[PDB]
Design an enzyme around this catalytic site. Sequence first.
Site, short mmCIF file in Angstrom:
data_model
loop_
_atom_site.label_atom_id
_atom_site.label_comp_id
_atom_site.label_asym_id
_atom_site.label_seq_id
_atom_site.Cartn_x
_atom_site.Cartn_y
_atom_site.Cartn_z
CB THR B 1 -0.98 0.04 1.21
OG1 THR B 1 -1.55 -1.24 1.23
CG2 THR B 1 -2.09 1.05 0.83
CE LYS B 33 4.64 17.64 -0.96
NZ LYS B 33 4.21 19.07 -0.98
CB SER B 129 1.03 2.16 5.67
OG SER B 129 2.24 1.47 5.38
CG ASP B 166 14.16 -6.10 1.47
OD1 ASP B 166 14.79 -6.60 0.51
OD2 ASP B 166 14.72 -5.54 2.46
CB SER B 169 4.15 -0.98 0.11
OG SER B 169 3.56 -2.18 0.47
#
Lengths: 233, 219, 246, 205, 245, 249, 74, 246, 234, 51
Positions: B1, B33, B129, B166, B169
């Site tokens: 995400t 941003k 997140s 890694d 998102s």
Amino acid sequence: DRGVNTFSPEGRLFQVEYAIEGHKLGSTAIGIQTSEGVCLAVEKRITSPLMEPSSIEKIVEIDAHIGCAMSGLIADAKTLIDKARVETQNHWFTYNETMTVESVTQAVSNLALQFGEEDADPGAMSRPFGVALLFGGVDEKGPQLFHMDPSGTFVQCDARAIGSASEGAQSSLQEVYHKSTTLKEAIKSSLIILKQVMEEKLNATNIELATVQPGQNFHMFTKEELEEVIKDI
Amino acid sequence: TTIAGVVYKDGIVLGADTRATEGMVVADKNCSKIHFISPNIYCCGAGTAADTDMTTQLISSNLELHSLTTGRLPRVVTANRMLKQMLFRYQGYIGAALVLGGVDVTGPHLYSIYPHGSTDKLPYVTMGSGSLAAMAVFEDKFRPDMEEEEAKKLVSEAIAAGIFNDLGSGSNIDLCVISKSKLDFLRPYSVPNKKGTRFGRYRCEKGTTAVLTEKVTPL
Amino acid sequence: MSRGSSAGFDRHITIFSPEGRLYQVEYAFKAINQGGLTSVAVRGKDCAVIVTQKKVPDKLLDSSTVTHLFKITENIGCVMTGMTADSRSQVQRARYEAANWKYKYGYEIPVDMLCKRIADISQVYTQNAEMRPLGCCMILIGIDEEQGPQVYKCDPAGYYCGFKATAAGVKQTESTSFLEKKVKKKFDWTFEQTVETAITCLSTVLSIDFKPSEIEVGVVTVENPKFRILTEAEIDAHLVALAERD
Amino acid sequence: MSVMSYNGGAVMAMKGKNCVAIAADRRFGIQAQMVTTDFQKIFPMGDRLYIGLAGLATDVQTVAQRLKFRLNLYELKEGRQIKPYTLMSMVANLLYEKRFGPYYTEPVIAGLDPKTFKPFICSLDLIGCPMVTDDFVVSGTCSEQMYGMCESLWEPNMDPEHLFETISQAMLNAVDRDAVSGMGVIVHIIEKDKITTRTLKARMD
Amino acid sequence: MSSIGTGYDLSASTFSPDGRVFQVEYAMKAVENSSTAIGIRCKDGVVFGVEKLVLSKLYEEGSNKRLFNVDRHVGMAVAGLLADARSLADIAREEASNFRSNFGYNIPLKHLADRVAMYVHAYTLYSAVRPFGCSFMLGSYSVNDGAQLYMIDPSGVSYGYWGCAIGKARQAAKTEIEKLQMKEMTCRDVVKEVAKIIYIVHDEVKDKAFELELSWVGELTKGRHEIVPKDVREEAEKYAKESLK
Amino acid sequence: MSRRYDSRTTIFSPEGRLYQVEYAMEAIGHAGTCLGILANDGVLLAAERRNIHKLLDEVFFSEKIYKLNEDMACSVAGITSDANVLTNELRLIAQRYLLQYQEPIPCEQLVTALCDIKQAYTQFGGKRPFGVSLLYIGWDKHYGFQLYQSDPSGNYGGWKATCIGNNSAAAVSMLKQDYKEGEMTLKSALALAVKVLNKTMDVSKLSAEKVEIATLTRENGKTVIRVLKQKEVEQLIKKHEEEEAKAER
Amino acid sequence: TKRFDSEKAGDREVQRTMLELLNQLDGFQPNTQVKVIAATNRVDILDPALLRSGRLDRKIEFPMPNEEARARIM
Amino acid sequence: MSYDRAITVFSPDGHLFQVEYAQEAVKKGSTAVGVRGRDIVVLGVEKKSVAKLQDERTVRKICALDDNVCMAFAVVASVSGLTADARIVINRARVECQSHRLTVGDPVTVEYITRYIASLKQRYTQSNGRRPFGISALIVGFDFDGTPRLYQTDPSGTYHAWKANAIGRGAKSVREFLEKNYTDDAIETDDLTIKLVIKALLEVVQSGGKNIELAVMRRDQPLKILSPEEIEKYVAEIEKEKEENE
Amino acid sequence: MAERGYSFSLTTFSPSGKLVQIEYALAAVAGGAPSVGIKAANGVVLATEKKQKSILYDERSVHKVEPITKHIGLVYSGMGPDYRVLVHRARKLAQQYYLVYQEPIPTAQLVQRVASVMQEYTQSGGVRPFGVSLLICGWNEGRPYLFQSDPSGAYFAWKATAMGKNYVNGKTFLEKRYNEDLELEDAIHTAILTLKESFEGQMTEDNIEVGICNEAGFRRLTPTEVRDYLAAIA
Amino acid sequence: GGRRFSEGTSADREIQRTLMELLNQMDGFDTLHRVKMIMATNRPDTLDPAL
């Protein structure tokens, strides 16, 4: 300066005092209640018979068993009657009986005075009405005629006249009308007084006649029947 | 995400973020941003849904603008924490926003986490997140509760790049937003990779195999 | 004439006048003197102190109840000077403004901000012809959260500015003059010295010297943010200290 | 700038860049549901007459809200004798969609435009009601966002002239229409100089 | 004052050269013209006393209410014109009513006196509505201050009193309260004494008869505010007549 | 409020026209001349800018002429504070009508809508009318090219060539003779416009700053609204002085 | 009544006459022994210099009557 | 928005002030005549002061409220009554006219619209902060049996059916003269109805056949507004016929 | 509020062609302390002198130069009370524009928006027309802006204008020394000369304030800097 | 103490003259070697502006 919303040194309201005198400029309302119907006679208030009598209205049906004739300040009256039609009909609609002449009269009397340039808004008054109404109709009890005036007084009437001279219109009544009398004399007794209270002539285009009777709705007189009654003075 | 982090160091924020906003692993936006400069001492990190996160921060930002100007003295962290909690809960919220609220008040630096509901809370380092856990594993150990500021810029560039590479998102590039307390420092290159497309030889349609169709002036 | 001349309806309600301000607005300044209170405000560097006369017009009063010192917040304290009718009313208006910040912000309002919200409030009264401006002024003390002890005063017409030293009263110009010489000659400011400057200046112009139950001293110290009433014993302490200065 | 659904019979924007010109390419598509009858009607609109903003989905509120936004852009354009900045308009649109609260109807804005009187390249897409989107890279947007995004990377000529971008773009639009129902229905390609707008209307169903 | 023919005493959003509105002062005469209300602060409660003038011999107690029960622990005793007293009563009742229900404890008076006086004063400011030409007191027994009595003037000024009288002989009544110690005396004794001051005020050559309304909020009622019980009420009046002579 | 401060600000007169409105006309007179002239392919506005002093940044296009919409423009003569409230609303209504309808805004439509707000103030509210008379220039697809005037009361009349400002009476009289209702091309129309400013303004040498002419012409199938440049205004002035010398001796 | 800034009329015979009462009224010129019985329906129009206690020492009120007072007159 | 104190109040004069000012303001005015035909029902006004530098568009006194209903207003006075005042009565009736037209399936009853008109001018007289308009209107239209009507209102709202009625220049003066003019054989064709409107207007018009503005309305087709050049041709025919009579 | 209120206008026109109260208000701006605002065309400088006359003002906050937001500033003329509402108002407007644009309010736009509210205050009752004149500075969109807002509502865009005490003299000096599109150094120097034209408000550093708008935003200047500019003028 | 007058009455006419003389003796060309003058005033706002 101070208002018309203030009391006079008499201890009475200034604005209500002025309103009654205002009535006297205009039209007349004669309603005679007999036990065979309630009749309303009112002046069209003409300048010529060349003024169509096709749809001059000043006796208007409030309900189809109650009619109303207006007197006083004719302009102010037009909105009071239009309004009166919806409120009587809300009552007719809910109760589903034939409205009583006394119920229509009480209801319109509180609207007379709500005046004031404080505690009022555009839908409320800022002046008292100077319209005196005669509501005439037949109910379940029978024919009744009610008089309403700007001070909200409602009274039962067997004959009430108010007009260009309110005083004048009444003095003639005593003289002509008598308590128990036929419908046909009742219509006539209005045409003789009608002249007295008017300063104007008897023309068929200058008077308007309507009868509300048992088993029979508010009726508007046509040119032929307007003439039958003019003949009866 | 999304990918957002803060670290607690000498000045209010060292922020790390990816530019990209992705729905799972598909790009909706190549660059954005996510850690925002709206003021220069109040910074806010974002995660989760983009819409929920933007409005919660913006509403605080407007109220902060008034205090800042009248006092001529710094923005108030607490005010920002309380404001997003009451205002977004009232609305009942479209989804969830993990938001990292941050301002230096009059006293020390305060960093806050507005969870996925709507709350005013006090920690000192936030990560926000689905990548809150992912961003945290590096941050929690290299930072040992105040470290050298300059060392923190090297370390954080390293952590931020690790989140990007890694964890899927984060497309395009990684952005770092540094404020000591009124600084506005932006370098959007906290990862080494090519920014857009590469065309050493220029063919993107064979040499005029199609021709120009009409020219008009729309005044 | 002047200060009672029609030129619009500006000697009745707020609209400008030939005088280059507003007549109605000027009665609101004149109004301060009527109340009979005079205040001296000194800003220290450990506290911010306001001393004002406390109007005692009966001998059937309890001391605690009868005051002009009000707690606006647990950071800000004030004195009201001018007409007492107007005093109670402004304080209740301020209180809603202090409280309104209080929930949103999550912390104590700055002295500067409290004065800004009330000052603007006093301007609405002043802008309006619907109501007349306040006959009183609120003079604030408080520890600003980084600037230090601060003294701000908002006008009865509502404009506010910061002060080292302020005065408002029956004699606004003279107290201020007495007060600049006390600042110039700089004894420095501790808890006791700054309070001492403040009381003496209020005593010297009017030429009274008080009982501790006819002056009120109110402070906001950096002992705690909460506003306190010092009460008569500590107020008496300050009175005796004034002797054999400077 | 919230529009009812997305069904407008076509939804596609691609913007692709050069250093000598920047281009925004658009479906000129109109008419909701699968059935169209028309292939003309404004969708990309000049707002400073040299910057564009594209609002995308169903015709009615797309035209309606654009115009109502145009009036606020205009106010700012009017007063001063120099016209508004792209970056300030970029947050302005973001907010305009946001005003339509939680569980809103989805638009997809694409702004393409060189910045006014600070000269650098700008491309951006908004969608949902979302976080700020300033990029200087490339942007493709719509509901078939992935399909547009491919193409927006595809045209950049960093050194060729303006003309070569157009001919590349004509093929780019066509291949996209065979891939989705969002491209096509007539195509309007806008090459934007800073001083004016050049409108070219492409041949392609 | 002034008797200018346009404004100042004919408006009240207009201040005089000095800064005062003449309209509140004309209203201030009104409390002086009718009978007194006395109210003294105890420390176990508050005892109020208003003499209600028997104007007509065909009245019963509860007529021309000068004594209101504001809540179930707050009183209001007024003096002056009863119409402005009623308004003041209505606002006070609603302000007290929300505080017990919501908070769950007794109201500290000093704030309440300030709020109601704010109401009085807000109307003075306006020229569209009038200054209130009543003077009234509020009294309460609290568990944060104990007994408190505050008196608010027709100007909207609030001061606390150990013992007040507002009415047609303030000077005679206040002085009698000064002589006596009722400031921290027990509510029971006070009932008799408040009535006795009412007896001095009243004349049998300016009044015929009055009907005593006292109100308890004190130790008999266990801090509940009720208008005086008929037995107690009578006892206190009985003492008032007997002790003068 | 008070009824002694009331002699009724808003009332009806038995002469039928409000006191405050006649009083507002004198104020309109005071501000400089603003005129509109019709062309048979455009319409233009010519007005003298409020500023005449050296000092002016020139942030607005012209203080008097407001570019409202891409087919409508108006000029103001009268109170500038009063001008700002009407011109901002005007900007919004004219714009909504061209934008949405795709049908260029009529002046006749525009005025009736604005005049309702102006009028409300004169009949009720205890208020007072606006200090400006505004001259609308535009093109609509209905009547064709148009010019409208509105007054403080909210009274309108549609001319095709009218002048307002100082020496209005003289101006309209000059205008009747040379222009009726359509005979002048865009260039003659513009020459006529400079001529009216010339007599009425004190300075008869003028300047590009002193006057501003903005034209609205439909060219190349789109309706173009443009503020003319200082060079273009100056070229029109230079052409007009030669012709001024020859015309009147 | 003194309050004049009158340059337009306002007599100022009347100004002298109110001022003169004060003059006679100060202690310098005796007035200790002589009482002045002053009467006014409106003290709502006067100034404090003329009135106010210790210049006209006693201030006697007459409030509205009540029933018993009505009883004795009748 | 509206005025807190009332413009119209009952005072002693018999009516009201604003009614009284309002009757004066249509008396002192110019002629507006309406004649009731059997083809078209036609209205015309004496003055617009046309001179060929201006064109009428909405500038007309005659404005159509409806597809078969139109009203011509004479606000018009000593110095000219207000087109501003008329337009409000016009806006409110027109929406109502169209709502009734929707409801009845044949051409809209004039009766409803005139009764309505009368109440609109009266409701302002009772409404706070407002006053009645100083117009007199000739409400014209055709019924739901196609019956042509010419009705009149005065300023306070009072209504009558009329064959022909004329207002302004002394209302009584002109309307008694329109009876004389009026023929029933002069309304039988469309040009003859129009000729009766115009003859009353010529009497004291300054620069006639240009100032004269009259519009025609058909059975449910929209208003046709006639330009003064076209009207001038009829004006010449009657002005000669009229000369012949004397 | 808890009253009936007012709604009648306090201004009625004149057969002169004037509004009476705004002319009284214009007299009050002249009675102020000198405030000058010049757009150089290399930044905007607003300078004022503030009559404190005792320097017992511990203002590190509110002044006659107060920043509205970070690239708008405001300087007034006249009386303080009217300023207080206008300064708060402007900050609110700054906030409204900040939410949508997120670049704080532009100067051309600000004036129109203040002008509309000022006009109501005259036009309506229960409010009155100001007697303050605001000078608004801003640098946004790579252009400096200077406007003057009159106490009626009117807005004019100026290159250099004066208000406060002896404005007539100020505007006339401003034309002679300053010509359009001169340097930032000239704008500042004449700005401080107008204050010096007639001072008399206690000559100490904290009695003049300048705030400057330029490419990097708006900040008010420390009183010590202001004094150095003054020192040059004799 | 008088005002500036010249719309006055006879009473005012006299008052300005007494006013005028006092200025000239008190602080004018003539001076007061040890005579000191004591003025008592309830409100001074009736006196001439020169005084």
